Amino acid sequence: YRAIKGMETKREIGGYTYKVVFYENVFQDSILLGNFASQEGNVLKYENGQSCWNGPHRSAIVTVECGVENEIVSVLEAQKCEYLIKMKSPAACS
């Protein structure tokens, strides 16, 4: 279970372009979602993004699962500053 480091993965969701750059940072349109803090296997935690209320800054958990290509699958608001994003990648398979 790996994810391709250095690559930009971007996908439009809800009208906004989600962009995840592996081992760097994530953006939603132009908003800084989160910076990569820690990741295990194929599940990546990004936090300390752009300031939001009721949270310190944005954050998201990306779960990169088995897929054919590195694509953003879904982004669901977990709390408000934190979102659960599902992704797929061939390297996240086995």
Report domain extents, the chain. Answer: 1-94
Look up residue 45 and give its two tokens.
């935690």
| 3-state SS class at 92 | helix
Residue 34 near residue 60, CB atoms below 8 Å: yes
Residue 3 near residue 64, CB atoms below 8 Å: yes
Cβ neighbors of 90 (< 8 A, separation 6 or more) are 66, 67, 68, 69, 70
Q: Does domain 1-94 have CATH number 3.50.50.60?
A: no
